[PDB]
Amino acid sequence: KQQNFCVVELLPSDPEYNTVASKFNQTCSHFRIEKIERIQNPDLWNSYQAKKKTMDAKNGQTMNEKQLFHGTDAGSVPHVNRNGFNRSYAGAYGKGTYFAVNANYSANDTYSRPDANGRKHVYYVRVLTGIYTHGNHIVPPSKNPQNPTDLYDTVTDNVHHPSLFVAFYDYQAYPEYLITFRK
Ligand SMILES: NC(=O)c1cccc(NC(=O)/C=C/C(=O)O)c1
Secondary structure, three states: OOOOOEEEEOOOOOHHHHHHHHHHHHHHOOOEEEEEEEEEOHHHHHHHHHHHHHHHHHOOOOOOEEEEEEEEOOOHHHHHHHHOOOOOOOOOOOOOEEEEOOHHHHOOOOOOOOOOOOOEEEEEEEEEOOOEEEOOOOOOOEOOOOOOOOEOOEEEOOOOOOOEEEEOOOOOEEEEEEEEEEO
16 A cells, blocks of 8 residues: 555636635735645545544544645655655644644745745645644643543644644545645
């Protein structure tokens, strides 16, 4: 299972396109979008769905999935397209992977670092946030001290008004779209 992938450009025409643009535009309408691409990685996608199938049947009425933003340098884009956000990724709440509710956070040059042509990249990612608590600065805390292998799926900065989520597990996030844009 080598998780090869294709990149398909999203046509302005595509219903999909407008949904990503709108959500991006809530907090980043001052940036100019060059393009939006869909990342098609069947092995990565299947393994993502496997964890979701598990997580749904486990968390009852909880909506496990959210769509969050993650900014990264150009160099990491191939890495992320193949391996999502699993383990071997160089790009005070955790040692997992951070994801932003609002594009503007991710659009910081420190995450969405401009390349030579001045182009910034932010993914719009399906993340399985599941059941979360407030996090502190490598594995999530345990839900129940009397049953402590049962863990929070993610942690967040504020539980009832969250602006970021941290994932620590494998196949917990799928990089469905990439948004390329400039200042
Ligand atoms: N990659 C992002 O878009 C993003 C979004 C929200 C938060 C962060 N990262 C952090 O706040 C801290 C990352 C780290 O300490 O490695 C990145």
